[PDB]
């Protein structure tokens, strides 16, 4: 939507949080 600060990359820092439980529970 015209100039994307961290909209398309939000899944790089926000995804880590959601995929942290299984990550730290199945490394």
UniProtKB/Swiss-Prot annotation:
Recorded superkingdom: Eukaryota
Q: Which tissues express it? A: Detected in bone marrow, liver and lung.
Subcellular location per UniProt equals:
Secreted; Membrane
Transmembrane parts of this sequence: 4-24
Q: What is this protein's function? A: May bind bacterial lipopolysaccharide (LPS). May have antimicrobial activity and play a role in the innate immune response.
In the record, the note on similarity to other proteins reads:
Belongs to the cathelicidin family.
Can you name this protein? Cathelicidin-3
> Upper lineage ranks?
Eukaryota, Metazoa, Chordata, Craniata, Vertebrata
Q: Which gene encodes it?
A: CATHL3
């Amino acid at each position: 939507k015209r100039f994307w600060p961290l909209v398309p990359v939000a899944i790089n820092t926000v995804a880590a949080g959601i995929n942290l439980y299984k990550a730290i529970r199945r490394k």
